[PDB]
Amino acid sequence: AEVRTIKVFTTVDNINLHTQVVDMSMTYGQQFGPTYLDGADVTKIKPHNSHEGKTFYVLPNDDTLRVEAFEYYHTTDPSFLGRYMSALNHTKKWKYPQVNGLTSIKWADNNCYLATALLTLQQIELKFNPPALQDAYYRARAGEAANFCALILAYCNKTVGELGDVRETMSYLFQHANLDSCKRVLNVVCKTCGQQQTTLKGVEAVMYMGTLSYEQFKKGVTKYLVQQESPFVMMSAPPAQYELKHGTFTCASEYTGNYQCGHYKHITSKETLYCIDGALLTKSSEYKGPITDVFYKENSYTTTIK
Ligand SMILES: Cc1ccc(N)cc1C(=O)N[C@H](C)c1cccc2ccccc12
Ligand SMILES: [Zn+2]
Ligand SMILES: [Zn+2]
C-alpha cells in the first residue's frame, strides 16, 4: 500500500510546537497516544490532508513534554490535559456575552456557577501562578473565556453539566493565585476563660464561612477581626435571605434552590445594583435574596477594639 505522510505540530502548552510527521494509514492514537484538535479527541482517527500544518495536543509521554507541561499548568496529574481538552471540547460552544462591562457565560450545562465566578474574578485583584491561567484569564477578560472556563473545570475536577459550589471553586483558584502577602489576625474572647488570637496566611486569610457581613466580623460574631492584610475578602455562609446596599460591597453570589441542585446568580455594585444572570441583566437600586457569598475589596485594616 502507498505509504503517505503529512507534517503536524504537537504540544502540551500551545507555546512550544514540536514538528511531527504522521503516517496517514495509522490513527494518531497509534503514534501519539491520546490526541486532540481543539479538544475533540482524535486518538481513534486517522490523519486527513487538512490536518497538515495544524497543532495537536498530546499527553506528556516524554521528558520534554512533562517539563513543558508542569511549567505551564503547575500540575502533574497525568489526567489533567485530557480533562482540560474534554471540557474545552464543550466550553468552546458556549457563548460569552459582554454583560454590564464584563464577560459572562450564557446558561448551558449548569455553568451558572462558572459564570458567577468568572464575573467575580474580573472584579477582584487576582494574580495567578500557573501561566495557563494567567494566559487564559487575560484572553478571558476580552470575551474569549473558552479556555479559562475549561481550565477551571480541570483544576476543580468537575465535568461539564455538573453543578459546583462557587466557594469551593474559588478556593481551588486561590490555591493557584499568589496570595502570600495575605494575612489575617482574629481575636476571640470570653469573660471567664481568656482570649485566643489566631493568625492566618494565604488562602485561609481571605475566606470566611459563617457570616456574610464584613462589618459584623469587625464588631463581633466573641470572635472579631483584629487585623486584615489582603486585596479583598470573601465572606460566605449558607444561603440566607439578605439585603445588599449599593456601595457597601463589590460583588455577591445568590444561590436560589436546594443543596447541589440550585441556581447561582451574581450581583455587582457599580453605579447602581445589577443582577447578572448569565446572559440576562436586571438593574435595581436595592437587592434582597438568597445570598451565600459577599466580596469586599481591601488593602489594610486594623481594629480599634481593645
Ligand atoms: C451547588 C453545590 C454544589 C456542590 C456542593 N457540595 C454544594 C452546593 C450548594 O448547593 N452550595 C450552596 C451555596 C449551599 C452551601 C452550603 C449549605 C447549603 C445549605 C442549603 C442550600 C445550599 C447550600
Ligand atoms: Zn469561656
Ligand atoms: Zn459566637
Side-chain angles (χ1 to χ4, degrees):
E2 155 161 66
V3 56
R4 304 182 179 181
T5 55
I6 57 186
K7 95 158 189 179
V8 292
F9 293 104
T10 61
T11 179
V12 297
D13 52 41
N14 181 96
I15 295 199
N16 307 134
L17 322 186
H18 306 297
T19 316
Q20 298 297 350
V21 198
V22 297
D23 201 305
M24 297 187 64
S25 80
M26 318 175 63
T27 64
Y28 295 106
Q30 297 184 53
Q31 325 185 55
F32 295 150
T35 308
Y36 311 84
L37 204 63
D38 320 357
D41 201 347
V42 295
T43 305
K44 296 178 200 254
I45 189 175
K46 292 192 198 271
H48 304 3
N49 301 268
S50 54
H51 299 199
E52 182 177 40
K54 294 174 89 296
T55 314
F56 283 72
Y57 276 80
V58 286
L59 300 186
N61 66 62
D62 67 61
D63 284 7
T64 293
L65 302 197
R66 292 164 209 243
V67 163
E68 279 180 355
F70 178 75
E71 288 207 28
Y72 200 62
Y73 302 107
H74 284 150
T75 180
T76 39
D77 189 355
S79 68
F80 184 66
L81 259 180
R83 298 188 283 108
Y84 167 29
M85 298 288 94
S86 297
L88 184 77
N89 198 5
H90 280 287
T91 66
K92 58 179 184 172
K93 188 44 160 66
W94 293 353
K95 304 294 192 292
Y96 298 81
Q98 302 292 287
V99 181
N100 195 236
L102 305 157
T103 300
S104 190
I105 320 173
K106 184 170 174 307
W107 193 92
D109 302 327
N110 298 98
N111 57 1
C112 57
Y113 77 120
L114 290 160
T116 304
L118 170 71
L119 296 172
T120 294
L121 288 169
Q122 296 170 67
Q123 279 198 266
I124 52 167
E125 154 185 315
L126 211 62
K127 295 254 153 178
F128 282 109
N129 268 14
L133 272 172
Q134 291 163 12
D135 294 340
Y137 175 63
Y138 173 110
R139 265 195 317 271
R141 292 200 300 151
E144 176 145 304
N147 288 82
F148 187 69
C149 295
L151 292 173
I152 289 175
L153 290 152
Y155 279 109
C156 302
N157 262 294
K158 299 254 123 43
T159 58
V160 185
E162 174 183 4
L163 199 81
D165 181 284
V166 165
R167 170 173 89 105
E168 183 203 43
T169 307
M170 300 290 302
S171 174
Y172 281 115
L173 302 186
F174 294 165
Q175 289 261 118
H176 286 296
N178 200 309
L179 305 171
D180 311 330
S181 138
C182 281
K183 177 197 180 193
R184 167 171 280 169
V185 190
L186 298 172
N187 205 35
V188 180
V189 199
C190 179
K191 292 177 180 180
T192 72
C193 278
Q195 55 194 279
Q196 267 284 59
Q197 181 199 260
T198 55
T199 63
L200 314 174
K201 283 282 232 307
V203 166
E204 300 82 10
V206 313
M207 288 198 111
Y208 191 86
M209 184 60 153
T211 302
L212 289 187
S213 156
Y214 203 7
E215 251 306 342
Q216 200 49 52
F217 194 10
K218 295 151 163 168
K219 303 162 176 188
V221 290
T222 290
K223 194 181 240 190
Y224 63 107
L225 186 49
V226 59
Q227 208 202 3
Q228 181 66 6
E229 293 270 337
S230 289
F232 63 94
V233 286
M234 186 187 185
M235 296 291 302
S236 280
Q241 267 260 342
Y242 195 92
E243 179 212 24
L244 303 154
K245 315 282 289 184
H246 174 239
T248 62
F249 76 108
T250 294
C251 55
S253 309
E254 176 187 82
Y255 190 63
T256 304
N258 275 286
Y259 193 71
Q260 302 192 117
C261 46
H263 184 359
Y264 269 107
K265 306 202 203 184
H266 183 262
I267 298 88
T268 206
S269 199
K270 293 198 176 326
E271 76 293 357
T272 187
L273 287 191
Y274 284 99
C275 179
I276 290 177
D277 204 7
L280 310 155
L281 180 52
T282 51
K283 58 171 191 195
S284 80
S285 193
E286 285 201 286
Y287 192 95
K288 87 158 184 274
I291 307 298
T292 201
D293 319 297
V294 189
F295 286 84
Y296 311 85
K297 280 184 222 171
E298 183 62 67
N299 189 275
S300 183
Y301 165 92
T302 301
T303 209
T304 45
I305 296 136
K306 298 157 175 171

